[model samples]
Target chain A: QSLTSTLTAPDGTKVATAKFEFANGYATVTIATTGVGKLTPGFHGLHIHQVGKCEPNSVAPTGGAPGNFLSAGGHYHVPGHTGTPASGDLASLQVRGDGSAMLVTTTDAFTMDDLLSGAKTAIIIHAGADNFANIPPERYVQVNGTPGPDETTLTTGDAGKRVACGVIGSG
Target chain B: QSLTSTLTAPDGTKVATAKFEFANGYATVTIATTGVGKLTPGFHGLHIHQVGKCEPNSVAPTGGAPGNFLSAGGHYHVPGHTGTPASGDLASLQVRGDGSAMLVTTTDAFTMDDLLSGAKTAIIIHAGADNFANIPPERYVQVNGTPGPDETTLTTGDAGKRVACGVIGSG
Candidate 1:
């Protein structure tokens, strides 16, 4: 089976495209971007959202103030499984000054069936870089027992606002 | 450029697909379904959602109880242009008892640029039929004080819950 998604900015501008071709135990993933420089010239946080929906300005299903890509809900996970570095997590999308990028990767974290298991999925790109919970413990204790990268950081990889998103679909 | 989407049921099972090829002034849309008989035998409501999201059992962007495909938001329309039979509105999808359907349609209502304008778009199929505001006034009063298919009816065509959806994306 195969799955694909075309990434677009909040304004629906085409930014990149991602395709997944699944085999026995692995899937070949290809992410190619056209407008790279448009985004900050660096690494951007990326992940698969639990939901396939992408709204320019909308609230998250979990409830909170409105935000771009919030409607897509938190990161996706396999049934009955929950933790940081969600199963939907992926390597960052690196952009250069020329406004172009490409990533050819492979993974066995999931199979095609998992992608088509009744829940829609999305490819989301954050406006900032992802620290992956690298914040130091000193910082956690420095702020009233709460750290800079608190629950929000762990959940969203400390990624900034959702800059681009695309729905994942398979056939 | 070209955009493609694979439509799936609330359970994430692939059911249909839509491909859009944008040209000078219009987009050629081709929709085809597999395992057609699997769908309820009848016409299903269809439209382009304001967001290119497809979530299962999720709340809508506008806020409300959770349901399938609600996260996709309302019907799509060009900025500053609002009216009934929205620009994103389209002919219903007809599925026969054999579980097959196909639709080849074209539209000039939107251009490739408009679709790529940051606000993602989605193709959604509703659980029920769309009367296109065919409900008679008599029935409106009989149902409740809200006469003649209120705003909700006009927007959703009283299409019931969303059953299938796919995000529109480009290459």
Candidate 2:
């Protein structure tokens, strides 16, 4: 099946719209967007979490919480960490000046099993993207900022807080 | 853990650098970039693909296939269809007068599982951010450019081409 979604930013600006095709245990996600407000001139964290929840503010994030959506936690770790960019848990998205972007992907990480099983997944936009390396666990990193879940314990690695949000499904 | 990453334009301009952290399931990707070569006018797609391929051309992606580092096929997923804002997919990152953007997030969809697996992720800078709620997928309806995987069942979505590339690692 295929699904299409479009969302506007809080600024009343049309930001991005995307489509997805679920098949072969893989969900091909394609995106096209616009007006993203002001970026900090760098990479931003981007990934599909386990739940869907975007409220309070659309631009900035309140910080604190890991998948606060109450789904599984971290990326789609049905397996485990393998020391590489697995199928789920991506680094983040990149930003240019035109306020437009194109994303294409095919992976079995996000499928009908996760989306329809009441996972309530979400594609979050972080303040920054992920480095994906192996940062020493002594960096005093907190997933959100509230300081609760350490980095070493979780897998996806601490990317950052949730700034922007978009829910996912298996139409 | 706090992952650090670098962002540069396709023209070889250091846009920003940042340290991202993921929590429960949410994250806050923060960026600090510099040197703006040629920026677009709107928000662009910015998210974590499945590889660590940047440098060389900075914006020129390698190893990860084409487009935003999703390998043209990796582990990134965008929100399919929605009437309101999606808590998963977000608009692009808007560059400021200083060519900087800070993306924060609280969504549970994004994760770091893919990066640690050595799937090769890239940071792509899109021409504009997405307006997640625009229907009729036109002009800026589909993601990046193409509608999605279904865009061209025989040719893949027209997800435009990638503008830049960045590799993720524990520098």
**CAPRI-style grade of the A/B interface in model 2:** incorrect
- lDDT, model 1, position B126: 78
Q: Which candidate number would show the highest lDDT if scored against the true structure? A: 1
Question: How large is the interface RMSD of candidate 1?
Answer: 25.0
- lDDT tens digits by residue: candidate 1, A1-171: 789998888888888888988875666666777653656654566788888888888898869998888898988897876776577766555554455555544455567777767758888888865545433332122133343235665666566789888889841
RMSD for all candidates, in order, please: 23.4, 20.1
Backbone clash count for every predicted candidate, in the order shown: 18, 154
**Given candidate 1, what's the lDDT at residue B33?**
81
Question: Which window of ten consecutive residues has the lowest lDDT sum in model 2 chain B?
Answer: B148-157
How big is the positional error of residue B128 in model 2, measured in Å on the Cα after superposition?
A: 29
Model 2, runs deviating above 4 Å: A7-14, A36-40, A57-87, A136-156, B1-171
